[PDB]
């Protein structure tokens, strides 16, 4: 009875705490998909020709002159080019962000069931 | 009865933890503003100097970037100092009141 | 004798946690001051490289907008802790040279060192404990 | 049985923990918004003054800057309202439901 | 008397109305063995070692020497760094002392 639930309390609260960084992960992953589309909120609406300071390398910022707004990157596949416009891009962002949050929401019951049952565990070996 | 000290000897003890992400978080930051401050000095300071972070850059000049370098360098070590003094002060506070209590 | 073999063992396990601190924080600057040469050192200008190029600027991660490049010559290079400063390429170039030769030695000088000063720990715990 | 209304106000417990660092967020990026607000509205030098999302930062002129930098921190500030009320919510449906759990499994 | 068997090692006490200072080991004596990996990688800090060592028992003899007491009672073993700055200290030293020499 009670050593074994002791056993099995600490147990559940690793597979929470691994759960819930991998929870913790793919928040990052759309968090650039929130960014990437925010960015692109202004690229349209601003014009051509504004001066844009980006990342040569890291910590290092080239300045550069702004053209085709209606034209992006879109960095999808396993790292492949593909040129979208500016207007598909935002479809696919948040197709992104509503898919980064189906990664999540497949885990997050399965996270508060080991949660739930450790705490189980806890009533268990308390009754 | 020996409980109500040996067990607030504990709750002292977790505060020191609960001291202990506040103070060193300030303390990383102090070191990286001993490093630029140092840098922008040697470098020339004629040319405009700008404030770049993480999602805005204002179009400055030295005499604006300089002050606040050397103004969140002092903030940050009496800080330190100040979350230190608070928190061991808490752990004093809750052994008398566990004493005053369950007697 | 096995018995002061085995305190020798645990004493020199543990000491070795707390090299791999230190190591992974020199570890950490190397590739980021290593990014910072090979791209410049390879473009080395707008100015340099012999007007108007192509580019495909970073806005994000994933989105990258193209457009015909052509800026003025100056590199607003990033310090830290708000602060900016516009440079040119022979400040940016030989400051970060300096810092890539000793990123390597900061690494490989202390990587020995660290090693010895995990021999002083278990060394030092020993000798106590078998005089008193 | 009565076991199973138990675990539905414990279940409601974690929901409201969820619910109140939602608020620690939203109120922070309502002044830090109101912040860099207060800093390129502190200057009368320049007119030049760079937004941006990631890495990029474009040139614009400030004026249409500040007032999009105003609805910067009006989202932020309308968010705090929603949540908070929100936050309320949580706690009064599960402190309540508390009311009829622990005095009648110990009566 | 107190009368113990213990040998005397050093010279005489700088005065018999000594301050007598009763350690139950303050001195040392130093042999290792094979580690974690066997055999430590280098000698030098062996040798780095070895030089604070001496120094340490240096002025365990010097701060007993102001402190006013001009006898040590020593229940561990006798360093050698430790006794030759014992000589010129005019401190009497006993190399080893028991359970019941202590109490």
Redesign the interface.
């Given at each position: 009875n009670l050593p074994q639930l002791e056993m099995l309390k600490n147990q559940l609260d690793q597979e929470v705490e691994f759960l819930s960084t991998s929870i913790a992960q793919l928040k990052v992953v759309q968090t650039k998909y929130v960014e990437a589309k925010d960015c692109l909120n202004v690229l349209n609406k601003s014009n051509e020709g504004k001066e844009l300071l980006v990342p040569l390398t890291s910590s290092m910022y080239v300045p550069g002159k702004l053209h085709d707004v209606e034209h992006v990157l879109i960095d999808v596949g396993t790292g492949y080019y593909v040129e979208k416009t500016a207007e598909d891009a935002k479809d696919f962002f948040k197709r992104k962000i509503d898919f980064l949050t189906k990664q999540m929401e497949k885990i997050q019951p399965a996270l508060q069931e080991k949660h739930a049952m450790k705490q189980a565990v806890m009533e268990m070996m308390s009754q | 009865s020996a409980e109500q000290v040996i067990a607030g000897f504990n709750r002292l003890r977790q505060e020191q933890r609960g001291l202990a992400s506040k103070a060193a978080e300030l303390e990383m930051e102090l070191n990286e503003h001993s490093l630029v401050i140092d840098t922008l000095k040697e470098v020339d300071e004629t040319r405009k100097c700008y404030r770049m972070v993480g999602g805005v850059l204002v179009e400055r000049t030295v005499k604006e970037v300089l002050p606040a370098l050397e103004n969140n360098k002092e903030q940050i070590q009496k800080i330190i100092e100040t979350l230190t003094q608070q928190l061991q002060a808490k752990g004093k506070e809750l052994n008398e009141f566990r004493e005053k209590h369950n007697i | 004798v096995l018995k002061?073999?085995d305190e020798?063992?645990?004493?020199?396990?543990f000491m070795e946690l707390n090299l791999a601190q230190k190591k992974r924080r020199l570890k950490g600057q190397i590739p980021?001051i290593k990014?910072?040469l090979?791209?410049?050192k390879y473009?080395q200008k707008?100015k340099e490289s012999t007007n108007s190029m192509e580019?495909?600027?970073?806005?994000?991660?994933?989105?990258?907008?193209?457009?015909?490049?052509?800026?003025?010559d100056?590199?607003?290079?990033?310090?830290?802790?708000?602060?900016?400063?516009?440079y040119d390429i022979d400040?940016?170039q030989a400051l970060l040279e300096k810092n890539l030769s000793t990123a390597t030695k900061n690494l490989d000088s202390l990587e020995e060192d660290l090693?010895?000063?995990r021999?002083?720990f278990?060394?030092?715990e020993?000798?106590?404990a078998?005089?008193? | 049985a009565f076991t199973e209304l138990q675990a539905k106000v414990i279940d409601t417990q974690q929901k409201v923990k969820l619910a109140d660092i939602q608020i620690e967020q939203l109120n922070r990026t309502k002044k830090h918004a109101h912040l860099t607000d207060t800093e390129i509205m502190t200057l009368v030098d320049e007119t030049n003054m760079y937004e941006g999302v990631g890495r990029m930062f474009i040139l614009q002129s400030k004026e249409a800057i500040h007032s999009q930098l105003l609805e910067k921190q009006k989202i932020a500030e309308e968010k705090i309202k929603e949540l908070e009320q929100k936050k309320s919510y949580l706690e009064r449906s599960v402190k309540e439901a508390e009311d009829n759990i622990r005095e009648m499994l110990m009566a | 008397g107190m009368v113990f068997k213990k040998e005397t090692e050093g010279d005489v006490t700088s005065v018999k109305d000594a301050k007598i200072a009763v350690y139950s080991c303050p001195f040392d004596g130093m042999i290792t063995e094979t580690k974690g990996t066997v055999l430590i990688k280098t000698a030098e800090e062996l040798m780095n070692f070895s030089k604070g060592e001496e120094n340490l028992m240096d002025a365990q003899v010097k701060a007993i020497a102001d402190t006013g007491a001009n006898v040590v009672v020593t229940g561990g073993k006798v360093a050698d760094m430790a006794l030759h700055y014992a000589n010129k200290y005019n401190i009497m030293l006993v190399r080893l002392n028991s359970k019941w020499d202590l109490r």
């Open positions: - | - | 002061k073999l020798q063992y645990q004493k020199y396990k980021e990014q910072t090979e791209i410049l473009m707008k580019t495909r600027f970073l806005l994000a991660d994933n989105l990258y907008c193209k457009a015909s490049v052509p800026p003025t100056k590199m607003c290079l990033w310090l830290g802790a708000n602060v900016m400063l516009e400040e940016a090693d010895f000063l021999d002083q278990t060394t030092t020993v000798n106590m078998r005089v008193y | - | -």
